[PDB]
Each structure stands twice: as C-alpha cells, then as structure tokens.
Swiss-Prot record, chain A:
Positions of the catalytic residues: D11
Annotated GO MF terms: (S)-2-haloacid dehalogenase activity
Gene name of this polypeptide: hdl IVa
UniProt record similarity statement: Belongs to the HAD-like hydrolase superfamily. S-2-haloalkanoic acid dehalogenase family.
Keywords: Hydrolase
Span list, region Important for catalytic activity: 176-181
Organism of this sequence: Burkholderia cepacia
Protein name according to UniProt: (S)-2-haloacid dehalogenase 4A
Curated annotation (Swiss-Prot), chain B:
Name this protein carries in UniProt: (S)-2-haloacid dehalogenase 4A
EC assignment: 3.8.1.2
Residues reported in the UniProt entry to bind an (S)-2-haloacid: A12, Y13, R42, S119, N120
Keywords tagged on the record: Hydrolase
Name of the coding gene: hdl IVa
Site feature location: Important for catalytic activity: T15, K152, Y158
Classification via PANTHER family: HALOACID DEHALOGENASE, TYPE II (AFU_ORTHOLOGUE AFUA_2G07750)-RELATED, HYDROLASE, HALOACID DELAHOGENASE-RELATED
InterPro entries: 2-HAD, HAD-like_sf, HAD-SF_hydro_IA, HAD_sf, PGP-like_dom2, S-2-haloacid_dehalogenase
Amino acid sequence: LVDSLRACVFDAYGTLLDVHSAVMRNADEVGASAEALSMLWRQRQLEYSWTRTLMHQYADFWQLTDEALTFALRTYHLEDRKGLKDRLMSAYKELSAYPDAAETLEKLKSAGYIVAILSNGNDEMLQAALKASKLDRVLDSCLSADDLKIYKPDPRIYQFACDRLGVNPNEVCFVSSNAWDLGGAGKFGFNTVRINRQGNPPEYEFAPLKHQVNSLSELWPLLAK
Amino acid sequence: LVDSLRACVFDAYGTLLDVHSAVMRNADEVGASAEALSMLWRQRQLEYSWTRTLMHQYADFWQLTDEALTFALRTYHLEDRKGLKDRLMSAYKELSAYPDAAETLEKLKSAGYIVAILSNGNDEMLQAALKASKLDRVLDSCLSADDLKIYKPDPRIYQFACDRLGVNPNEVCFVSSNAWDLGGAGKFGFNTVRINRQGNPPEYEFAPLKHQVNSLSELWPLLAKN
Ligand SMILES: [Cl-]
Ligand SMILES: [Cl-]
C-alpha cells in the first residue's frame, strides 16, 4: 500500500548470471560463429521452456539447455560438436555471475530484505552456478520452476514465490533483465525493476515497470531502506 | 501414414506463406541489417504469442507482428522507422506464397480431402495474404487462434480444428514448417508432416513426425488417393 516492500526476488539466468559467458569463455574453440551460436542457444532454450509449458510436455531446464545447445551446434555445422558440447555445458553449469551481483545481494540482505531467487533453472544446475559464483551464501531462498513443472511466465510460478516467502505481490520488488519475465511478474502484481544493461527497447508495455536501472549496483540507492 | 485421413490441415506463416519475403522485398530500404532484422522480428512475434498466452494477456497476431517489428526496428536503431514500419507491415499483409503451395492444395482438394488452414494469424491479416496469393480458392476452411484467443501449441487450438472440421485427431494430416507447431499438433494427436526446406536439425522429438519432406509438392505422393 504505502511502505510495503519486504522481499527482493531476483531472476537468475540473464540477471544475476551472465548467459553470454558460456560461449564467450570458449569463443576461440567455437570460431567466428560464436556470437550467432550463443544467441540461437539462448532463444531455443527459452522457446522450449515456453512451448513445452503450453503443450504440457515439461522437462527440466538443464535438459532444455542441452537440447537447445545441440540444436545450435548442429545448425552451425560445427567441427567437434561433442568436445565442444561438453565444454559449453560445463561452462553453463558454472555460469559467471555479473560483477556486482554478490555485493548488491549482500547489501539488500543487510537492509533486512528477504532476498530470494525465482528461476526456471532446476535445483541441480542452479545450485551449481550459485555455489561457484558465491551467490548462494547471500540468499534467503532459492525457488525453482522445477518444483512446479511449470515455467515462467505462467502466473503460478510468481504465486509460488508469494506462498513460499509469505508475502503479498505488492510487498515484492521483482528484479529481472528478461522483459518477458518482467511482463509476467508485473501482470501478476509484483513491483518490477528492470536491469537494462544495454538500453534495449521496451516490451510488454501492458505491465509497466516500477523502475529501470542499468546495473545491479544501481539497485542499492533505489532500494536503500 | 495410411489414408483413413479426411483432412489436410496447414500451418500458414512459414509453411504456405514465406515469412522472409516481407523484409527480402524491402532489403535495400532496410540496409545491411535486413536479415538480422528479419530474424528478430520473427523470433519476437513468436515469443509474444507464447508468453502472452502463458501469462493470460492475449492480443491478436497482427498486433504482436506490429509490436515485434517496432521492437526489431528500434533494436537496429534504424533511420526512418515510421516509413519502414508501414512498408514492412504492408508487405506482411500480403506475404508471398511458397511456389508449390497453390498447386499442391488444388491437387489435395481434387483428391477429396478437406483442405483447411489452422493459424495463429487473425482473419484480417491472413485473409489479405490468402487473397493476394490466390490461395483462397484452394481452401475449404481457414481457422484462426483469434477465435479462441489462445495461441499454438496449446492443445485447445488443435481441438478447435477437430471441432470445426468435424474430424477426429487421427483423421487429420497436419502440415507445418514450424517444429514447435508439429510438437504441439503431434502431442495432441494429429498425423504430422514437416516441410523441412533447408534440412534443419530435428526438435521436439517426444512428438515424432509421421513424415518429413523438403517441399510442399512432395505431399502429393504422400497423400494421393486411389
Ligand atoms: Cl549484458
Ligand atoms: Cl525456408
């Protein structure tokens, strides 16, 4: 209503964790298609999450990441799909965190916010990435779409966060770099803040943002209690 | 695929209609980003259709096409987005048919099949494209997502086709170039045939295809009746 925020709920893949880094770290082994491969990998991973939910054929996020990567490597006819695939999936398992993630989650946790992740990622892949990047120690809760077998932006995933954290939608500040996820969270009723790193155009305008910043570290002035 | 089939149900955008022609015909006006622009427009159009159904914020396919193009034009920071938008939307309204589309639908209609389209596209945009390409005369029925306000691959849209056409799922041969649409249709229970023109890798393998061909013309030996 007037002084309401109790919880900062973060997206993982694209917001706290850098999805470009799995291919970036291996770009020389991939060759000059690396950027195109990386974009195709990401678009199919997300496509599969959406279409499989619509058609009621769920599989977990690691499996979709794998299928999307296989499809992308095949599309680009790469040499040594197999060794390349192993390296790229290992890099994905421990996806690099954005440089300001750890510090800004610490700062929010110290201001006394419930600090949580809400992610499409299943526990195994998510916990592996959060452990490697040290983000797991600065979280109250990490909530997985794999508990529901239903992906974002179905409202039941945002409802899961509310129910687990014991908060109402208007007591949540929902932070994401993914416009579709901000669209679903905003429609659902979270207060949404976009991390817009590259000044990408607006989308999903029927669910306006509360705020937009260009880095995680700009969340702290904004959310300082 | 044994013929106790009563209906051939076709995807429109990507299968009968060439989604690439809207930018290709205006590539000089767009400049060197034309292909990357074309790919983003298409990807976001489809993204919008999936995510809006998942979050219960339907809008029609023309609106999504417009929003996706506006987004793609801004992403590429294009000069004269206003003029380009008008040109590209007009081109989309009358997308080119693939070369074998009209003739193959006529052969199928001659063999006594119900020949129908089942499309995400709303009637206004789809009818314009169908008329411009003379595909109108080779069709029994044109079914739209806009009737139910629910996009593919949600099973209710495939069920809508069964309902309107008076057929069971297993009496349908469902034809598409879009792997997600074949996945949805196949899981629903239609007999699925992929048009894979460029030999793209397989996807959605939990819903196997009945057949794959590289051209709509190849549907003729697959479906011709005694
Ligand atoms: Cl970025
Ligand atoms: Cl093609």
